[PDB]
């Protein structure tokens, strides 16, 4: 809705930024994805603290990868450590597509949105992490 949806300028920490670049890089052309742990303050500030990743596949991002089981499983670990984090959004890497969101990537983003209203979608370019511009 135009009356409550505003963009989320993401403050990305060292732990998230490095994690995402490395994970995509090794998998190539197998694409990796995951949920992002962080905290949400303001009506627009998201700090991305840390990430864990979902199943890689040789077709890359798909509906099959996204299951509530992985997420639910993680949350139980979050309690046990005594970490508080709610889910800020999700990430993926596209070596096999550009920054444009692929047809399977939108499907995957819609599911993740149902769980956290404020959801962000990130393209990582693992390939570019080899060169000095990322």
């Amino acid at each position: 809705a135009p009356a409550v949806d505003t963009a989320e300028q993401v403050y990305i920490s060292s732990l998230a930024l490095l994690k995402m670049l490395k994970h995509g890089r090794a998998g190539v052309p197998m694409e990796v994805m995951g949920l992002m742990l962080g905290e949400f303050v303001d009506d627009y500030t998201v700090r991305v603290i840390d990430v864990f990743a979902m199943p890689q596949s040789g077709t890359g991002v798909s509906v099959e990868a996204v299951d509530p089981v992985f997420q639910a499983k993680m949350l139980d670990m979050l309690k046990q450590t005594g970490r508080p984090e709610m889910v800020v959004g999700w990430y993926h890497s596209h070596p096999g597509f550009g920054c444009w969101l692929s047809g399977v990537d939108i499907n995957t983003q819609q599911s993740f949105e149902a769980l956290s209203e404020r959801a962000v979608a990130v393209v990582v370019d693992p390939i570019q992490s080899v060169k000095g511009k990322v």
Binding site: D76, K79, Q80, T81, G82
Partner: protein, 195 residues
């Protein structure tokens, strides 16, 4: 038991070497611990169970988990030349509360005392009074201490018990043959509230 996270203590003592609990009390304790896991789940299924050895420079074998399989893997290695240190195991349950699964659950320790207490009585009576305010109570299963001397452990439990919302009890199972099955007598069904 019912929305409670518990740490279960198994004895390491020289007294475990006895034939009174067949074949040996060390091996018997494995049967006992699985009774404690199974009983707690039976009453309500919403609780967690852990296992600590007080062997050597006290090591947590396994932390709070609903899984009986995890506890049982860890129990087979044990120090049969060790000795029970009652005082240190309480300390391990204190640390556990800050960061555990079931953070918001209640606090209880169920302890076996299969051998006399090693840690000075006075220190322990006094320890109980601090423990009442944080709201963790200790329930002691006594069959080792009673043979030698009068129950010191009784004093500890008395002072401890107040308002906590969880209670404590001294349960006595006999020092002679009764096998592991004696664990039924314990507050793993006999437990009550403090509030």
């Amino acid at each position: 038991m019912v929305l409670e996270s518990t740490m279960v203590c198994v004895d390491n003592s020289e007294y475990m070497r006895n034939g009174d609990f067949l074949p040996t009390r060390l091996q018997a304790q494995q049967d006992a611990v699985n009774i404690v896991c199974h009983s707690k789940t039976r009453s309500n299924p919403e609780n967690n169970v852990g296992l600590i050895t007080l062997a050597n420079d006290c090591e947590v074998l396994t932390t709070l988990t609903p899984d009986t399989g995890r506890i049982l893997s860890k129990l087979h290695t044990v120090q049969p030349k060790g000795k029970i240190t009652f005082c240190t195991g309480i300390r391990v349950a204190h640390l556990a509360l800050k960061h555990r699964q079931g953070k918001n659950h209640k606090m209880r320790i169920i302890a076996f005392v299969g051998s006399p207490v090693e840690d000075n009585e006075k220190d322990l009576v006094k320890l109980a009074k601090r423990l009442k305010k944080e709201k963790v109570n200790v329930d002691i299963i006594n069959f080792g201490e009673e043979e030698v001397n009068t129950e010191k452990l009784t004093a500890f439990v008395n002072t401890l018990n107040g308002k906590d919302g969880t209670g404590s009890h001294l349960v006595t199972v006999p020092p002679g043959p009764s096998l592991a099955d004696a664990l039924i007598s314990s507050p793993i069904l006999a437990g009550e509230g403090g509030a």
